[PDB]
Symmetry: C4
Subunit: 38 residues, 4 copies
């Protein structure tokens, strides 16, 4: 399942560390300026 975050982004690569750290998730995408995790 997916998760939102409060971490600002312009590109997907920036989302991989928060998504791993916070949720142990392996996939991240930048959506309307914030990281989501999948």
């Amino acid at each position: 399942g997916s998760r939102p975050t409060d971490i600002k982004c312009s590109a997907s690569y920036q989302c991989f560390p928060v998504c791993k750290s916070r949720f142990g998730k392996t996939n991240g995408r930048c959506v309307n300026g914030l990281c989501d995790c999948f």
Copy 2:
């Protein structure tokens, strides 16, 4: 609890690798230019 670092940052997404490496912490923030780890 929280731990500071000496590591300069322009955005919070940059602080997650720092915080995991340095402290095993899963959360962090770029706080007025330096990573804090929570």
Copy 3:
């Protein structure tokens, strides 16, 4: 061996979280604007 991604990058340091999360790979490189993992 190599597993290319469609994750945008400008610098190889940006690719290591990508490559670790997506493939368990401990190396990579930004190659023509995209992360490549080995």
Copy 4:
């Protein structure tokens, strides 16, 4: 011990993912334009 990389950097936050991923190191520092790990 220390490890060198051929990964370009302008700031030491950028070295933490490579140093963790390649070497399991907990510290990184940008030196003469390249990440070093310890």
